[PDB]
Design an enzyme around this catalytic site. Structure first.
Site, PDB file in Angstrom:
ATOM      1  N   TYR A 101      -5.226   4.553   5.162  1.00  0.00           N
ATOM      2  CA  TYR A 101      -4.648   3.264   5.495  1.00  0.00           C
ATOM      3  C   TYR A 101      -4.443   3.135   6.999  1.00  0.00           C
ATOM      4  O   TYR A 101      -4.513   4.108   7.752  1.00  0.00           O
ATOM      5  CB  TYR A 101      -3.329   3.073   4.745  1.00  0.00           C
ATOM      6  CG  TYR A 101      -2.156   3.820   5.343  1.00  0.00           C
ATOM      7  CD1 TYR A 101      -1.973   5.172   5.082  1.00  0.00           C
ATOM      8  CD2 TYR A 101      -1.207   3.168   6.125  1.00  0.00           C
ATOM      9  CE1 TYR A 101      -0.901   5.864   5.610  1.00  0.00           C
ATOM     10  CE2 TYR A 101      -0.133   3.853   6.660  1.00  0.00           C
ATOM     11  CZ  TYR A 101       0.015   5.200   6.395  1.00  0.00           C
ATOM     12  OH  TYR A 101       1.082   5.891   6.918  1.00  0.00           O
ATOM     13  N   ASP A 161       0.624   2.577  12.885  1.00  0.00           N
ATOM     14  CA  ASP A 161       0.345   3.635  11.931  1.00  0.00           C
ATOM     15  C   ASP A 161      -1.122   3.585  11.533  1.00  0.00           C
ATOM     16  O   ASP A 161      -1.758   2.529  11.561  1.00  0.00           O
ATOM     17  CB  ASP A 161       1.249   3.498  10.696  1.00  0.00           C
ATOM     18  CG  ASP A 161       1.269   4.746   9.828  1.00  0.00           C
ATOM     19  OD1 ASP A 161       0.533   5.714  10.116  1.00  0.00           O
ATOM     20  OD2 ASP A 161       2.042   4.764   8.848  1.00  0.00           O
ATOM     21  N   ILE A 174       6.554   2.441  -0.074  1.00  0.00           N
ATOM     22  CA  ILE A 174       7.091   1.089  -0.140  1.00  0.00           C
ATOM     23  C   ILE A 174       6.388   0.301  -1.250  1.00  0.00           C
ATOM     24  O   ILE A 174       5.202   0.520  -1.564  1.00  0.00           O
ATOM     25  CB  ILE A 174       6.993   0.423   1.249  1.00  0.00           C
ATOM     26  CG1 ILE A 174       7.857  -0.832   1.335  1.00  0.00           C
ATOM     27  CG2 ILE A 174       5.567   0.121   1.641  1.00  0.00           C
ATOM     28  CD1 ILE A 174       9.337  -0.560   1.231  1.00  0.00           C
ATOM     29  N   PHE A 209      -1.987  -4.390   6.469  1.00  0.00           N
ATOM     30  CA  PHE A 209      -2.550  -3.076   6.171  1.00  0.00           C
ATOM     31  C   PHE A 209      -4.059  -3.101   5.977  1.00  0.00           C
ATOM     32  O   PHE A 209      -4.572  -3.856   5.154  1.00  0.00           O
ATOM     33  CB  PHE A 209      -1.900  -2.473   4.931  1.00  0.00           C
ATOM     34  CG  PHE A 209      -0.510  -1.981   5.154  1.00  0.00           C
ATOM     35  CD1 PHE A 209       0.568  -2.843   5.083  1.00  0.00           C
ATOM     36  CD2 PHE A 209      -0.283  -0.648   5.453  1.00  0.00           C
ATOM     37  CE1 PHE A 209       1.848  -2.379   5.284  1.00  0.00           C
ATOM     38  CE2 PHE A 209       0.997  -0.180   5.663  1.00  0.00           C
ATOM     39  CZ  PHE A 209       2.065  -1.049   5.580  1.00  0.00           C
TER      40      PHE A 209
END
Lengths: 384, 375, 107, 820
Positions: free
Chosen positions: C26, C37, C56, C99
């Site tokens: 990801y 990230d 999450i 994402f």
């Protein structure tokens, strides 16, 4: 009121008494026994005497009528002033030896501590008031010891220093309100040139020794710097300069300062406000005591970070306290941290701000996690 | 418990190894001696094989041994409220100290060989500022006794053996031009902290050895833990020995310096303070007789407490002798105007009753002959 | 409570259900485009067990929606993300998340 | 813009270098929670690429290297570094394989020295812990100060060490090229950051045996040949990198020291076994020696009747060869030991051509060369090199300073010791951080884990060697020193530490002497701890004194006079915390007094007998200051003890003056009872300070005087009245429930026991008339009361058991004494 105070109290400038003789010529002649001479306090500019309402007390130099101020150093309590000699004469009184009893030449009374010891002296620090006793006790013998020249020079400087800035403060608050408008100033003209020249003299007097000096002699210069700065704080001018900034900082700009002190002081406003900040930094530089005193009023400097007249000076002033006092970091709150971060946003990428932040994270090898998390909470996720 | 106490083979291997290691170090490693101190100083004293360029300017960059002294000088001249313990300074100071001495009708023609070699070995150190480094460290200890100042005094003695003339010259010159007060402030503070004989502590120790405590993992018989009387007996010895060596060789200039320091802002009379300490030792030795005056014989720990107290008293008297020889008129007047006489009469009273009591038997022939040389 | 958008088709027929570990590469990003990230910087696939709410919930539900081997784009609102509390010192409070999910494999 | 552009944009470079300094500062000193946050801003890929970026500027390159170390390595390196100072060597076959020299054929005395850092080390060191950096994971439901502490972010270490070896090889060869474009802009910027990484990985033990071999080849090839490529030592390096060179060598020297210690442990393992076997066989021969011997067997069986501490000392006592007759060891074992001593000193290079041929000679040659080549200007570098030089020469001294921390452990308890070392790791790591509730919970859990670890009792000597008592003492000293003017913040961990120290003293006598050296410091620190309630540091002081005669009773008179001055203050002023809770104002503190008096009780009374030296001294100190006794018996204005006990009864029994008047607080102070317990403690303390009976008949002047002093201070008649004072008797009523009083607010038999002890020790019962006089006024109703309450219901009640202990401990022996 004069006392017999112990500890490091009397190794300071408050215990400096000048043996001023009554003779115009050869005032530096070696003292014989029982020579009439006045006593002066250099740091306050006042003369020791005995008055009617409150006995043996230091009095202003304008009322030293040579009767209540003159004193004689007598060999013993037995009943014993000879002619002045055009030279040193016989060297009799020694430094650290040759014990003397100080007696009023007029009243004939001897120095003695106040015999009762109240409840304050029952448990607290032992300091005893001196009373000019009629006969005196047995242990009323007094020693005379030398004092250093450089601190004596500071002692003479500290009185004129108090006089100029105290008179400046009195001039300043005289126009606290009452805007000038288009007429003359509120009162007498301020001593701008005298104050500025004094500021330059004191800043140079408190300049730290240069880095490239030899390691041996430099440490002695550090000791001299610490001693002089300690005396100045102990005489209270660290608070006095804070009053100077507090009085001046309530005016937004030089033009706003012209409305109160007059147009003539508007140009000098920027210079005096800067030089006070550097003088304050010089006073607090490298001092554990002076840096530790700003923990109580830490929010004073933090509340003034947004002012545009002097940012570098105030930031460096803040830097001095943090890099020496570990306990000051414990007092830092979230609001102060956000205000310091706001300095970056309101003044650009100044690298000294990050130096302040680096100082906040760790004090003398001990981590302060209460401030580290706040800094990374408020600064890092923003990414701006 | 002794007959029911379990043999050695029944102990667990790990437990047996634990006290085996401490016994091995106590009996084989501590007993082992290694002589490397002189070879260390020899290595550090050679500023060789860097002279390939032989520059005219010849600034004489310090040799490795000189760099030790300069580094130990700066760490003592730096400004600190309390002077801390440095294990490295412990080791290097002890190495320097015991790298100097290296020591029946021997003749004086070969006798002067060891002396001029010892003078060479001390010259190897004091030519690099070690005398002033010792002076700085003594003035920097601020009157706080410890292993640091003990090692410093040990080095000062090892560099001052035989009363080196030029070493005393350097030390006196460094004090005269520095004009610092802290040196004699420390000397007075350390000497005033020197311990004297204590009856109460001696009685407590006597009860402790009467009980005879033992540990758990085995047993130590009559444990020799640190005595609370004359714990600093060697420190009191070599402090006065250092003071004696400073005035040895009839250095009248330094002798007047001890009595008074004209250059210094304040004067601390070391001679008067020395008399005061001797007075305190006189009282303690008097009451330690008075404890045994009622008794008849002196036990083992008792005579050991005499022996070490008397050896300290001997060192004090030798230091006093060196203070006044030459003769030094200033010191002679100071002794006259001191409380020395009270210690003299009290010691004479002690000496009489020691000689009479100890002569009744042949068990204290030693404590008598070490008595006799003291007066 | 999330929005997905396929980027490159993969299987399109297999769905990640309970019983098999979910492995992704990801790349999360902030609402303004500030990347914070990823996994390919660490050069190791990220393995997480579907079911115990360790990750999450927006990511969990998006991974549950999208099929195997199919590169996807997710969008997690603060209501399905850390939201008001926020990740300490990393993600500001009440931030929208984007994402670049690549479900490379199961188990 | 490109990062390499900052080599020209000096304005941006300085700021970003300071930014990297700030990134190190926020994550400094084990702030692993923040360290995980910083992984988002600077990632693994960026840091690894930035290591290899040869065109990066100086400050930026060093900042990135030191940032990588701070984020991923510093916490683990720090904790492991602290763990390297201790040598806990388990007894394992791999430990048994440890030898001073590798198996060779050079010489009988010794062979060529083994390569440092190469081999196996069985010394216990905790494994590192790492948590992979993840941000998509759900926010934990646990809150602050309850959630477990964050670990250091993970990073591939095999890849990191291979990159470091490759990069260092590149730098070394570039050094030999004499290139005019060094990486980073200078030799210092080229070599210092990489060597810091190498040193950190070496400390962490990441490198393998072959990796260590490569490093040794790089540092000095020809000397380190096991059996241009120029070593580092010939590169005429600047001062700054020389410091890192020394830091590398003091690690290799540490490795050599650890190898020696492990060899000693292996030799001890073998030697104990063979010595035990020989001692067993000798003991068996002694069992049959009585046929061919006589009463002189006492010298032969002295070993087996003597404890093993001096048995091994005698057995080992054959070094100087003048004591072989006493030693019964066979010459083969004696040869084994002296041989191992021979190669041990040969390994240390004592006794047994420009090639150093060893690390010991190489370091000394290099350091001397550096010193004589130029005047070194860095004081830290000077201290660093001479630390190395001293360690090379003093081979035995460093071993002698490492053996006291050495210890051997059983193989079956290695995981338990591994656990306690892990628990101690946090304990050491928390003394460098300001006290907080989050750290408080962690240390409280760590202390509880120490409690639950059975090794803490099995091996007190090891627990003393680690010096936990020191660390737990300073972690208190931080709290006591912090805010001693206002209030002692966070008392929850203070009482936990005190409970640990108190539980530590009772383990053994040596644990008690370790605390015994720290009384005057602790008693001084107890001046402000009076406000705190619970396990005060005074109880730690008492626990270091209880049940020990020779050791614990050497308290100085300065200590005693300063404690009684504290008692004078407590008897002169009210408790500030009592006043803060709304309690009525009375001019002295009973809880504080009674707390001091139980300490002084233990200071003078040990093993059932009074201490003569402590007794008179303490009684003299109380009798100088009459305020110590309290309002009663002050002299004039001091009412009788019967008046004091009566008013204490009325205050305790009547509320609105016994407490706040607004145990519910679980330590609810009752003023009337606290006053009454103060007077009971004072009488108990005097009774325990009483001169002994056997000394009384000797006619000792001060013993007689002191007894008369206590009799004059405390009249006997008031004590008789106190004995005659009734109890609060539990009854049966109110639906048959157990009607019982409040213990800490009602009259108790313990205060009467304190009366009895004073009676049987100070005044004594000598005649029948005064015996029966006290018996029928105070003892008979109480002894009847205990029997009456002994029923099917009240016998198990707390008052009845109080009577049972009260009679059987103090009352009943007194009548048993006065039976004739």
């Amino acid at each position: 009121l004069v006392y017999y105070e112990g500890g490091a109290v009397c190794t300071h400038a408050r215990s400096l008494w000048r043996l001023e003789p009554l003779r115009i010529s050869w005032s530096g002649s070696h003292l014989r026994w029982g020579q009439p001479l006045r006593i002066r306090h250099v740091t306050t500019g006042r003369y020791l005497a005995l008055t009617e309402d409150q006995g043996l007390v230091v009095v202003d130099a304008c009322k030293a009528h040579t009767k209540a101020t003159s004193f004689c150093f007598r060999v013993s309590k037995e009943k014993l002033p000879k002619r002045d000699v055009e030279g040193m004469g016989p060297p009799e009184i020694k430094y650290g030896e040759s014990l003397c009893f100080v007696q009023h030449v007029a009243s004939g009374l001897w120095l003695t501590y106040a015999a009762p010891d109240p409840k304050a002296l029952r448990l607290g620090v032992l300091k005893k008031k001196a009373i000019l006793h009629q006969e005196g006790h047995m242990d009323d013998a007094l020693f005379l010891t030398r004092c250093q020249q450089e601190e004596s020079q500071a002692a003479r400087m500290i009185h004129s220093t108090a006089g100029l800035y105290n008179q400046f403060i009195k001039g300043l608050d005289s126009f606290s309100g009452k805007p000038r408008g288009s007429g003359p100033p509120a009162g007498p003209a301020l001593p701008i040139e005298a104050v500025i020249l004094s500021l330059q003299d004191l800043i140079g007097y408190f300049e730290p020794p240069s880095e490239e000096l030899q390691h041996e002699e430099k440490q002695s210069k550090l000791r001299s710097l610490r001693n002089r700065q300690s005396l100045f704080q102990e005489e209270g001018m660290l608070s006095l300069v804070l009053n100077c900034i507090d009085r001046l900082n309530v005016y937004t700009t030089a033009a706003h300062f012209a409305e109160y002190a007059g147009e003539e002081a508007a140009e000098s406003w920027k210079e005096i406000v800067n030089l006070l900040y550097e003088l304050l930094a010089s006073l607090i530089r490298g001092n554990r005591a002076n840096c530790a005193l700003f923990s109580t009023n830490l929010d004073w400097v933090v509340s003034k970070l947004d002012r545009l007249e002097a940012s570098s000076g105030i930031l460096e002033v803040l830097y001095c306290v943090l890099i020496e006092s570990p306990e000051v970091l414990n007092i830092i709150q979230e609001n102060h941290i956000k205000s310091i971060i706001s300095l970056l946003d309101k003044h650009g990428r100044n690298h000294k701000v990050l130096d302040v932040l680096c100082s906040l994270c760790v004090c003398n090898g001990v981590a302060v996690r209460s401030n580290q998390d706040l800094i990374t909470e408020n600064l890092l996720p923003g990414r701006e | 418990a002794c007959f029911r106490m379990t043999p050695l083979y029944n102990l667990p291997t790990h437990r047996a190894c634990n006290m085996f290691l401490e016994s091995y170090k106590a009996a084989w490693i501590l007993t082992e001696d290694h002589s490397f101190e002189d070879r260390m100083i020899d290595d550090l004293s050679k500023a060789g094989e860097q002279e390939e360029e032989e520059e005219e300017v010849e600034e004489k960059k310090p040799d490795p041994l000189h760099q030790l002294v300069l580094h130990f000088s700066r760490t003592a001249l730096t400004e600190k409220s309390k002077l801390d313990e440095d294990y490295l300074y412990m080791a290097y100071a002890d190495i320097m100290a015991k790298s100097c001495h290296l020591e029946v009708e021997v003749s004086f023609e070969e006798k002067e060989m060891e002396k001029q070699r010892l003078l060479y070995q001390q010259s190897r150190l004091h030519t690099r500022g070690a005398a002033e480094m010792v002076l700085q460290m003594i003035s920097a200890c601020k009157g706080e006794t410890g292993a640091m100042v003990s090692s410093t005094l040990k080095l000062g003695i090892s560099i001052l053996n035989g009363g080196n003339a030029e070493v005393q010259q350097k030390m006196l010159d460094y004090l005269k031009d520095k004009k610092e007060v802290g040196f004699f402030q420390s000397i007075q503070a350390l000497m005033q902290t020197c311990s004297v004989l204590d009856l109460n502590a001696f009685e407590r120790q006597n009860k402790a050895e009467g009980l005879g405590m033992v540990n758990e993992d085995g047993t130590v018989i009559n444990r020799q833990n640190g005595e609370k009387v004359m714990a600093d007996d060697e420190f009191t010895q070599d402090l006065f020995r250092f003071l004696q060596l400073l005035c040895e060789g009839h250095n009248n200039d330094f002798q007047n310096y001890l009595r008074t320091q004209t250059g210094n802002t304040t004067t601390i009379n070391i001679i008067i303070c020395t008399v005061d300490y001797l007075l305190r030792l006189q009282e303690s030795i008097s009451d330690f007789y008075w404890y045994y005056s009622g008794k008849d014989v002196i036990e083992e720990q008792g005579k050991r407490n005499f022996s070490k107290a008397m050896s300290v008293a001997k060192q004090v008297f030798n230091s006093l002798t060196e203070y006044i020889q030459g003769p030094c008129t200033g010191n002679q007047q100071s002794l006259a105007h001191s409380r020395l006489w009270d210690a003299v009469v009290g010691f004479l009273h002690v000496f009489a009753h020691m000689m009479m009591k100890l002569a009744q038997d042949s068990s204290q022939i030693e404590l008598l002959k070490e008595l006799l040389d003291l007066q | 409570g999330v929005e997905i958008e396929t980027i490159s088709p993969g299987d399109g027929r297999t769905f990640p259900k309970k019983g098999q570990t979910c492995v992704v590469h990801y790349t999360g990003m902030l609402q303004n485009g500030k990347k914070f990230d990823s996994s390919r910087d660490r050069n190791k696939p990220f393995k997480f067990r579907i079911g115990k709410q360790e990750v999450i919930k927006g990511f969990e539900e998006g991974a549950a929606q999208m099929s195997l081997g199919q590169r996807a784009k997710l969008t997690c609102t603060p209501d399905v993300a850390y939201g008001a509390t926020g990740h300490p010192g990393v993600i500001p409070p009440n931030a929208t998340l984007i994402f670049d999910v690549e479900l490379l494999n199961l188990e | 813009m490109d990062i390499l552009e900052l080599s020209e944009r000096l304005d941006l470079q300085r700021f970003h270098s300071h930014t990297l300094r700030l990134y190190r500062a926020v994550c400094a000193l084990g702030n692993n929670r923040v360290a995980h946050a910083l992984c988002s801003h600077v990632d693994q890929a960026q840091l690894l690429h930035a290591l290899e970026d040869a065109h990066l500027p100086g400050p930026l390159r060093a900042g990135y290297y030191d940032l990588l170390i701070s984020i991923h390595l510093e916490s683990a390196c720090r904790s492991r570094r602290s763990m390297l100072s201790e040598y806990i060597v388990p007894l394992t076959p791999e430990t048994r394989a440890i030898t001073l020299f590798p198996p060779g054929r050079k010489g009988g005395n010794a062979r060529r020295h083994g390569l440092p850092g190469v081999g196996v080390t069985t010394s216990l060191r905790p494994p590192h812990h790492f948590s992979p950096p993840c941000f998509v994971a759900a926010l934990p439901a646990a809150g602050v100060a309850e959630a477990p502490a964050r670990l250091s972010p993970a990073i591939p270490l095999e890849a990191l060490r291979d990159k470091a070896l490759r990069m260092l090889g590149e730098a070394v060869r570039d050094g030999g090229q004499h290139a005019r474009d060094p990486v980073g802009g200078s030799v210092e910027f080229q070599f210092v950051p990489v060597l810091k990484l190498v040193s950190t990985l070496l400390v962490m033990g990441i490198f393998g045996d072959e990796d260590v071999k490569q490093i040794l080849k790089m540092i000095e090839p020809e000397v380190f040949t096991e059996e241009l490529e120029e070593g580092l030592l010939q590169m005429k390096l600047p001062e700054s990198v020389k410091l890192q060179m020394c830091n590398l060598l003091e690690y290799f020297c540490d490795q050599e020291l650890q190898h020696r210690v492990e060899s000693l442990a292996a030799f001890a393992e073998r030697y104990v076994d063979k010595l035990q076997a020989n001692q067993r066989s000798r003991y068996a021969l002694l069992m049959r020696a009585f046929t061919m011997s006589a009463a002189e067997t006492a010298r032969r069986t002295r070993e087996f009747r003597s404890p093993p501490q001096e048995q091994i000392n005698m057995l080992l006592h054959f070094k100087d060869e003048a004591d072989e007759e006493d030693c019964p060891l066979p010459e083969d074992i004696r040869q084994d030991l002296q041989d191992f001593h021979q190669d041990l000193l040969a390994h240390c290079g004592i006794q047994l051509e420009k090639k150093p041929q060893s690390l010991q000679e190489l370091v000394s040659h290099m350091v001397v060369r550096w010193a004589q080549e130029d005047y070194v200007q860095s004081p830290e570098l000077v201290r660093a090199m001479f630390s190395l030089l001293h360690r090379q020469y003093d081979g035995l001294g460093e071993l002698l300073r490492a053996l006291p921390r050495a210890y051997t452990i059983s193989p079956s308890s290695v995981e338990d010791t591994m656990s306690l070392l892990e628990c101690l790791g946090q304990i050491r790591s928390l003394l460098i951080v300001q006290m907080g509730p989050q750290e408080e919970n962690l240390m409280i859990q760590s202390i509880g884990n120490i409690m639950n670890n059975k090794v803490f009792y099995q091996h007190p000597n090891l627990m003393r060697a680690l010096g936990m008592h020191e660390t737990v003492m300073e972690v208190m000293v931080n709290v006591l020193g912090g805010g001693e003017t206002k209030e002692i913040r966070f008392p929850k961990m203070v009482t936990s530490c005190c409970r640990f120290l108190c539980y530590f003293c009772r383990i053994s006598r040596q644990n008690q002497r370790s605390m015994f050296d720290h009384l005057s410091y602790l008693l001084e620190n107890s001046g402000i701890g009076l406000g705190m309630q619970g396990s005060t540091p005074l109880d730690v002081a008492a626990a270091s004194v209880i049940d020990n005669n020779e050791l614990a009773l050497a308290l100085q008179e300065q200590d005693l006079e300063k404690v009684v001055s504290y008692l004078a203050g407590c008897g002169l002023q009210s408790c500030p915390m009592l006043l803060a809770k709304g309690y009525p104002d009375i001019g002295w503190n009973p809880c504080g007094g009674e707390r001091y008096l139980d300490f002084l009780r233990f200071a003078v009374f040990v093993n059932g007998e009074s201490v003569e030296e402590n007794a008179n001294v303490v009684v003299r100190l109380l009798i100088r200051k009459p305020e110590c006794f309290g309002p009663a018996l002050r002299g004039e204005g001091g009412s009788g003890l019967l008046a004091a006990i009566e008013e204490a009864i009325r205050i305790s029994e009547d509320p609105a003056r016994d407490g706040p008047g607004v145990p519910p607080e679980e330590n609810r102070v009752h003023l009337g009872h606290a006053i009454m317990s103060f007077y009971a403690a004072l009488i108990d303390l005097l009774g325990r300070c009483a001169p002994e009976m056997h000394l009384i008949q000797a006619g000792k002047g001060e013993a007689l005087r002191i007894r008369a002093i206590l009799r004059s201070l405390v009249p006997l008649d008031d004590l008789v009245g106190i004995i005659s004072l009734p109890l609060q008797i539990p009854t049966l009523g109110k639906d048959g429930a157990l009607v019982q009083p409040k213990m800490s607010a009602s009259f108790v038999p313990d205060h009467k026991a304190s009366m009895v002890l004073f009676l049987d020790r100070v005044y004594g019962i000598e005649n029948q008339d005064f015996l029966l006089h006290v018996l029928d006024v105070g003892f008979l109703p109480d002894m009847r009361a205990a029997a009456s309450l002994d029923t099917a219901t009240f016998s198990t009640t707390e008052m009845a058991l109080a009577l049972n202990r009260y009679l059987c401990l103090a009352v009943l022996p007194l009548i048993t004494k006065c039976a004739p």
